[PDB]
Symmetry: C2
Subunit: 665 residues, 2 copies
Amino acid sequence: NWTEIYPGVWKATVGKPESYDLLKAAGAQPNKDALSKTEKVSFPFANGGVSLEVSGGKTYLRFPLQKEEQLYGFGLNFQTVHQRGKILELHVDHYGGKDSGRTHAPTPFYVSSNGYGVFINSARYIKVWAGTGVRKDSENFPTPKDRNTDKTWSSRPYSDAVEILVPAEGVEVYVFGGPKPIDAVKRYNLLNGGGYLPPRWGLGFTQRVMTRYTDKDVEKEVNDFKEKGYPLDFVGLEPGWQSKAYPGTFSWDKSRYPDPTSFVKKMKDQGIRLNLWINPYISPDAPFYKEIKPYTGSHTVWLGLVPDFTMAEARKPFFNQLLKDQIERGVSGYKIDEVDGYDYYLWPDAAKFPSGLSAEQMRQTYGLLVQRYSAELYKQRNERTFGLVRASNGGGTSFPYVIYNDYYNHQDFITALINSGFAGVLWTPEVRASKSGEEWLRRFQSNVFSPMAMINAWASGTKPWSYPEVEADVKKFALLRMQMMPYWYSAFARYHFEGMPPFRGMGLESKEIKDQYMAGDDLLVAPMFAGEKSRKVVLPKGKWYDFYTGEYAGDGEVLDVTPGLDKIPVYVRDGGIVPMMPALLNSPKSNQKVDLEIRYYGNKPGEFKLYDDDGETFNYEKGDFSWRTIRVEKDKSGKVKGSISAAVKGKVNTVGKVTFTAMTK
Amino acid sequence: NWTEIYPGVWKATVGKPESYDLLKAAGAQPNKDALSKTEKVSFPFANGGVSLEVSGGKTYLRFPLQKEEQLYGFGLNFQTVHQRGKILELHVDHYGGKDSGRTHAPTPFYVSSNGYGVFINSARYIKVWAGTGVRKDSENFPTPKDRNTDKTWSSRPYSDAVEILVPAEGVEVYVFGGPKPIDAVKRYNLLNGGGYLPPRWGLGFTQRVMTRYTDKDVEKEVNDFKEKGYPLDFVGLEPGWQSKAYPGTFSWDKSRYPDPTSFVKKMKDQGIRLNLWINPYISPDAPFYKEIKPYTGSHTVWLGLVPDFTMAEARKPFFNQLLKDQIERGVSGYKIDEVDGYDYYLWPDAAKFPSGLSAEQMRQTYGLLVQRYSAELYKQRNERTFGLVRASNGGGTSFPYVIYNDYYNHQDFITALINSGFAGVLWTPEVRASKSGEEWLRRFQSNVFSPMAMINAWASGTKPWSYPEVEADVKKFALLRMQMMPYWYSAFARYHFEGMPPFRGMGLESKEIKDQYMAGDDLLVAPMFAGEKSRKVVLPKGKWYDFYTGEYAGDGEVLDVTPGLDKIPVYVRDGGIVPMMPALLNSPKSNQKVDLEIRYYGNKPGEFKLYDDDGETFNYEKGDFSWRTIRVEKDKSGKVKGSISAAVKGKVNTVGKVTFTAMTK
């Protein structure tokens, strides 16, 4: 039976569900308050066609489709956005170059253009036929045709249902109502706890440095950023911070980092946090090796033991070491690597774990487990974190981690950014290296319109300025990222409080758009790729304005755009507002006031909700935050008129002088 | 426990095996007599390391590997022959362009270079890690290394075991002893019943004609073959013989084939058999539709019902129709198409079948079922058949079918031919079309050194003579195929009686050879591909002789060969013998004597066992067959000296005048 458990959210338990699943793995708590404020819409399957059966050891699910209907989601796909007519096996893995279901976050959640969603809460590998099955007993069974004589014969006849097979004796299913597709995604994300509310520093620039860097190499690089006037908030350390890697000791190397306490402190005194690479695979020389060994799996990954993080006995030594040796020294967060695949690196499905959890469910949830328990260490200290993880799944919306990978096709990197919005996870299209300055800049441009502005120079040793032909423009985009901080912070606040993904596909206010995305509420981003001089941009109905000049761009039409090397095509909705702080090189501290220039586009009266709090603790959970409403219009003369609501008594206020600019002359 | 059930064959039952599996699906009877004559070798795993466990709904199998060891098999792979270090999910499908385990015959049987084999008798999809898992408790656990400092660090450390996961509560496992790899394959094949003993006509030439051909178009084509002096034994009809296709009526079309009885008879009177295309998917206009409908699956394939051939109630109407409407008219056999995939054509794993058999086991065994029951119709009439099928599996060695597909990479076509020898199935690299005469001839050359000499002109309308630049050479190869009939027939007799695959890889008397195969006992075939003028040939130790001129070629060495367009590189072992009949255009009838020229190569004294029987019935089962031993040598002078053993009283004797030729001058 379908229980309406929240407004627009229904739960069904089919057969006998397993005692481990995605939500339980994640320890994900629904945001009940946010959910209760959503509209109480009706059940999206109102005309039958739903079937939930257990048979022969498996759970068979069927959901009807209508002729008009398109589907989105099924996780972090890289080459496809429309999912109807697709066949997948959802399976955590490093992306393999095709959308098979093998990917870093194979979220078993899909959304329909008719305005609903469905989440299958199983930590098993799941098979999906998204409208390919043609049932003899179907109400829409097409009329058989004779291929010998009939030109209209079809090799893929009409299918009227999504079919899912779960290899278990039952499953929990969740259905999310609309009325719009984005409504279903928001409710799904709120069921997961909402997005994490990141620290402001997490939205600044991060440079990861070569594996070999010593503490002195890092200090010099920090100094070079400062000297050249490039922003930087956190530095990523790669495997050479550890005394051994692959497998790891999770202790600082004595030669390269002889005094970690002093090193972390110095960086912090200069405004610089550190984010440490780990994979979770245990060296014999790790200090907690002997203690953890019985609570590890049968199989190793690069000769490291694999902790069973479902066991307290594995968690305690592992996470105590991170806590005592790094977090308590000031380390801001982690890059949780190599928790996805490939199959020939990670443990086989044939492996055994001491808790008795199947290796399959462990593969599906390992990234969730390491995200969960690492994040808790920070939350216990009233400190936000923000980091990187190479695997996640359903249940992982609330974690402070962004997905990245070693794939590099730029176009597909943007497609994954789109799909991240359907998958309850964050994705960054990171910058590593490039064969040209052109490509470097194009990549850097799209990267600063994403969750995390980052160069990963683990092997390349690149810095933002490494391509002289484009360095002046790279600097400009790096500074823009800082200036847009209040815009991004407010978008991320919406993700946390309302489940609104900050990056998402078009049409989420009939043909597939794989190369444009909305960034926050106000910006349509249409990346250029190396070797292109122009591109088409599909604009939704309503007027849009050029992000750079404020000039009218179009309304419900296709544009041909030749932006030049120095611009990424970005368009602002009519009445859209981007609050801009100064081009600071470091995120502003909680006790700091920052001036804002409110850039207002078009002529429709605009409204923007600016989020404000200390930007670094969990004090917001106790109500120490504010939303400042900004409204902007042009008066009779065409002169800008703006207001900002009053600061709230007793709350953090980081808003300084506020000025308004009508961008559309 | 391991029961030695035959010499060199051990069976273990782990947990609770399912009541349906590959051997039962196939109805495969062991050839006990042939098996009892094999050597009683010892159990190949003599030093432990074997583990067979049931846990969490699944069966976990582990078999040890030694450092030296290479592995072969895991079915009909197209790009790989060495299988150690591979990860697969064995799953019937049309080949998808990579060796993932998805293929037409994903036989769960592997062979080791140390001289044993292992068969997993499950009709489920099976996962295989062929030496990739690295167990912490392993006796060969490599010493962890620090990737930060150690240049010898390995991204894929040494693995000492084959691990297999079967999704069921138990499984039957078979282990085959050696001493040689080929011994394990022979015992496996004999356990399956041995290969089918084909009719001689099955080894002649077959032309499949365009979908649209009428009975008159076929008669004309038959006449053109005769007029141009090209051999032909059987003609393949494509979907236009049926009154409707996709889905099918399994009844002759009234417009294109108005008088089937008369048509089949006429062709037969001219020496020409017919082989009919089917897929097994049922049209509403099929005469047995209403009867069969309740015994079909939930899902359709191209809008045709899918019979549950595990049910007598489905088998009876389906096979009665083939029997009465076609076989009883004289139709020689079938092309069983589209029983493999892709997933978006065939029924989903989510489908249900009336017998309660899982859709998964049905997918794995459908080709086996249609092979089994079609073949029985012929055997009941004391008539051999020989045809084509697009899917098979373990258990299918004894069936009279050859695998083909719509893939076309020529190199990979040869690799599949090699792997067929490890997989208990037959494969033909068919000829369809070509962009050049060069390619046409190269393909035709390799095709006449295979199980079935065939052009499939369903779409291309090609005939052997369609490329004028090479037509004279094509004709020569077509006639060679006929001349080599006694050679091929004897090789196929060894497949039936001894389990010896007629086509197989090298080293089956340390690096991968993917482009040479043994064809019968005596011939090493090394195909040329279009665009190549020369190639390397790796010759085993022992002397080899050029197939065409008889000249010494080499011994245990690599040759660089520039054969020209008119030759496929073929080498004959020292003392090797190829019996050649005349260049007949049609296979000889059972009451017919045929002269033989015994072509003897090298100088080592040679011995050849020539199989002889009626070539068309199952009378051989009652002992009406002979092996004639042929021995050939050069005397003191260097002059050829040959003998053939005496015809056996009471047995068929089709051997006419026998002459001997020393090819090596």
